[PDB]
Amino acid sequence: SPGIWQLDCTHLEGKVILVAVHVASGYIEAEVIPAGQETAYFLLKLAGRWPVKTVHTDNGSNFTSTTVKAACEWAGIKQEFGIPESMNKELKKIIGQVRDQAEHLKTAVQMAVFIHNKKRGGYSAGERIVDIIATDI
């Protein structure tokens, strides 16, 4: 799954966290969003950094946004319904383990992303996605 991703939302402290998972590696990026333009922005930034070819979502929210459709078209990203899981739950453990170390939840979110991608034994999620993309190239 070189450029296959999936995009979910989770919630903490009355806020929305947008979570992209690189399916084959477990690598993740996340960001605190309001609910539209900011998902399109998130997607464009992801696509500039990694190969992003197919993004799966499991509801209709993302199919009803003209800015998200514009970003998909601009960057060549194909939006796909249906799931190609527990990191919303694994991410939230880590956020909690670290929440007291930052004022802003969003900082705690990015701390948890860091720990998730860097840990793990053999290869970590961050090393996997790079291994997966290196071989492919």
Ligand X SMILES: Cc1ccc2oc(C#Cc3cccc(CNCCN4CCN(Cc5cccc(C#Cc6oc7ccc(C)cc7c6CC(=O)O)c5)CC4)c3)c(CC(=O)O)c2c1
Binding site for a copy of itself (CB under 8 A): 29, 37, 41, 44-45, 47-50, 74-75, 101, 104, 106-107, 110-111, 113-114, 117-118, 123, 126-127, 130-131, 133-135, 137
Cα–Cα distance between 115 and 67 in angstroms, integer? 31
Query: How is residue 71 written in tokens?
Result: 């970003």
Contact 112, 95 (CB under 8 A): yes
Looking at the Cβ atoms of 24 and 69, the one nearer to ligand X is 69
Q: Hey, which residues does 57 pair with through a beta bridge? A: 81
Cα–Cα distance between 126 and 32 in angstroms, integer? 21
Binding mask 67-106 for ligand X (x = CB under 6 A): x--xx--x---------------------------xxx-x
| Residue from the set 9, 10, 16, 41 that interacts with ligand X by CB under 6 A | 41
